[PDB]
Write a protein that binds this DNA or RNA. Structure first.
Length: 62
DNA sequence: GCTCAAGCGCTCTGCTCCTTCTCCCATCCTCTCGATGGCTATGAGATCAACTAG
């Protein structure tokens, strides 16, 4: 039952939550992906400070 | 009978045991199922601050 047509999802400035102005959840609600603690961890190891700021502040909830 | 002792109870850690208390338990993603959610009136008095004239 795993048809790719039900797994593809992309987000570009869609709806945001009400408690926090962060992107919604679930492709059904046009929500973005979660840049979690391990992702920030790997970006820290990279040293991409500007990319980390863009992901966690600029592209999430300015 | 005149000074070193022997004890002595009281206090100060302290040492270990037992008990109690707070936190903690990978990431991301999809879907459905259920629960939830509140909606007295109508009138009476009385004050007050802003228009509308004087």
């Amino acid at each position: 039952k795993h048809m790719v047509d039900d797994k593809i999802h992309s987000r570009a400035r869609g709806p945001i939550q009400i408690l926090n102005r962060q992107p919604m959840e679930g492709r059904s609600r046009d929500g973005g992906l979660r840049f979690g603690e391990m992702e920030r961890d790997c970006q820290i190891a990279h040293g991409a400070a500007q990319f980390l700021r863009e992901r966690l502040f600029e592209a999430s909830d300015p």
